[PDB]
Amino acid sequence: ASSTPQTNVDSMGGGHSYQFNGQDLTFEDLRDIKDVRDSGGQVAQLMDYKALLNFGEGCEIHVEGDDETKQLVDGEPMTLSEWLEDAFPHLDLLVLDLGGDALWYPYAVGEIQETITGEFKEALPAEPWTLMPESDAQGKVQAWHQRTKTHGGYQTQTLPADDLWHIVINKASARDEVGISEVLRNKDEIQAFKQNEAAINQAIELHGFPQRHVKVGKEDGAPVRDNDLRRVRTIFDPRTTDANTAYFTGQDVDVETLEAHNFDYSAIHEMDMRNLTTALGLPLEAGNVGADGLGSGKPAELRFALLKLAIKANQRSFSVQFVERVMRPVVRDYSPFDHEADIRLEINDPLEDIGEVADLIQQVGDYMTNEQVAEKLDLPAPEDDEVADSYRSPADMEKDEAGV
Amino acid sequence: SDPEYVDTLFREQLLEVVMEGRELRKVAREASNVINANTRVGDVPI
Amino acid sequence: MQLRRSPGMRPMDRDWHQERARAREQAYSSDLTSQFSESEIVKYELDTAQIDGSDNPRTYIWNRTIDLFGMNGTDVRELRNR
Ligand SMILES: [Mg+2]
Ligand SMILES: [Mg+2]
């Protein structure tokens, strides 16, 4: 075969803007995403729930053959997992920030930083709406263009792809390294939701409440002018009326009522929330709306399976890139360990029920090593390797040892 | 509050800025000895 | 003291912008007297809005009497050579 790709890719042209950079989006489109995120209300909350499902349950670092890595780091033993856990102490927060950013924006992006002494400090996320990639004909990123607000207006600069790293959850194709904003992709669905919400709110103001209509004068009788109506307005004023005010009139004054004109705003709200949640890939139940019939049985099993599948796909997409483009370079450059080691980063299942896992452990624990049970139960494996590796319970081994 | 117009997303909104007028140079607090007086009238002895 | 209608305050009123935007979108000509109330012309300073019918979409949308070809409702400023 060949050592370089020989199929081409759809590439550059700046989406047919001019002075070409990025692919098919600009710093203004990026700041449009920023406003959808920061502007609050129901849309912002839903995409915040999407971040929390994908990344909010935290993470665990794995290395295959971790025990083989045992080395004195600074006159003190560590494995590669132990070194990585000390290198990335707050990884649960970083994963939620980067993962959330990579759902909102086309990418999460950031630096590696060093202490003054030149040891690793942190992986530092950058503000993704400020940065856009420049890519070559093969589709790979070569430089990053940044612009940012300052007291003196906008400041602009260009950085090499060497010392930045980036992560893309929403690829257009397996070869895409610029990605898609799900927010820009669903701009019409989001704007339709906002428009219908505004429509309902204003319709409730006009039509949800009755209004008093005083008609003055006899029909086909003497006309009443504006100054005449002002004196009548003074009598029936809702400012000064109270619940049990009573009215006395001649026959030629009529207190009519604009009734509240019924419309099913609840049904329109449910329709809007269905459209928006389906467009953003969330279940309808996330929007504080419940469908009939769908709340039970195999209809529930399917939708909650689809949600868990979508989460696993996003999680693995993130995990692979984070290990390959953040962890491995940090291990290579700042660690006494082998950077080609089989590092993994699992991200926890947000909808796992430990009560269901307990039932599983009771039913089939007889086929699981104590380490496998401890992993499923989300606890440290036993400190003693023979009992960790054995199949029967550590408590059962202890009560049998107590018989010796 | 009750705004007559709603603001839509993706900055399809109205252009919402004010351009500043001329701003005069302010220096007296730095360019002189400042006395924070206890009374609105008073005396410096020479 | 300033009121929302007072002449120095008009540029701060959201409604003055929004109604001038409407006036530009609904007009067919610079002839305001025909198309708007005296109240609207004064309240929104419509003499100073660049009203001429060039911003009204109906200036550009086709509306022929007979429509064999689905030509009606097409907007010339959305075509390839515009
Ligand atoms: Mg008469
Ligand atoms: Mg004195």
Residues of C in contact with B4 (CB under 8 A): 14-15, 18
Q: Does C15 touch chain B (CB under 8 A)?
A: yes
CA-based diameter of chain B, in Å?
Answer: 67
Is B7 a known ligand-binding residue?
A: no
Is C25 part of the contact surface with chain B (CB cutoff 8 Å)? Answer: no
Q: How far apart are CA B37 and CA B45, in angstroms?
A: 14
Distance A229 CA to ligand 1 centre (A): 17
Query: Which resolution in angstroms does this entry have?
Result: 2.7
- CB-based contact C48:C27 (threshold 8 Å): no
In the numeric block, which tokens belong to residue A249? 């009139």
Give all chains having 3 or more CB-to-CB distances under 8 Å with chain C.
B
Coil, helix or strand for A20? coil
With 0-12 / 13-18 / 19 or more C-beta atoms within 10 angstroms meaning exposed / middle / buried, residue A59 is buried
Chains A and C touch (3+ CB pairs under 8 A): no
Q: Which residue of C lies nearest to B7 if distances are taken between CA atoms?
A: C14
Question: For an interface test with A, which of B4, B10, B19 has the most A Cβ atoms less than 10 Å from its Cβ?
Answer: B10
Helix axes A187-207, A265-279, angle to 10 degrees: 170
Nearest CA in chain B to C19: B5
Angle at A93 between CA A91 and CA A96, to 5 degrees: 105
A35, B12: Cβ pair inside 8 Å?
no
Q: Which experimental method was this entry solved with?
A: cryo-EM
Q: Is residue A323 within 8 Å of residue A164, measured between CB atoms?
A: no
Ligand 1 centroid to residue A219 C-alpha, Å: 12
With CB atoms and an 8 Å threshold, state whether C15 touches B3: no
Backbone torsions φ then ψ of A193, nearest 5 degrees: -60, -50
Q: H helices of A160-296, where?
A: 182-185, 187-207, 226-236, 265-279
- Residue A370: exposure state from Cβ atoms within 10 A (0-12, 13-18, ≥19): buried
Q: Could you tell me which of C21, B7, C17 has the C-alpha nearest to residue A201?
A: B7
- Say yes or no for a CB contact (<8 Å) between B9 and A31: no
Among chain C residues, the shortest Cα distance to B16 is held by C14
- Radius of gyration of chain A measured on its C-alpha atoms: 32
A190 contacts in chain B (CB < 8 Å):
9-10
Please give the distance, rounded to the nearest whole angstrom, from the Cα atom of residue A217 to the centre of ligand 1.
11
CA distance A196 to A268: 8
Q: How far apart are CA B6 and CA C43, in angstroms?
A: 21
- Six-digit token string for A355: 């009560």
Whole-angstrom CA distances from A162 to A93, A141, A166, A296 are 25, 10, 11, 51
Which 3 state secondary structure label does DSSP give A376? helix
Element (H, E) at A103: helix A91-104
- Helix ranges (DSSP H) in C1-82: 14-26, 32-35, 38-43
A236: CA distance to ligand 1 center in Å? 26
Placement of tokens 């708007």 in the chain: C36
What separation in angstroms does the CA of A111 have from each of A127, A341, B34, C47?
11, 23, 48, 55
Q: Which two tokens stand for residue A261?
A: 């004109």
Q: Which ligand is nearest to the CA of A223?
A: 1
Establish whether B16 is an annotated binding residue: no
* C8 reaches B (C-beta below 8 A): no
CB A325 within 8 A of CB A167: yes
- Cα gap A364→A361, rounded to integer Å: 6
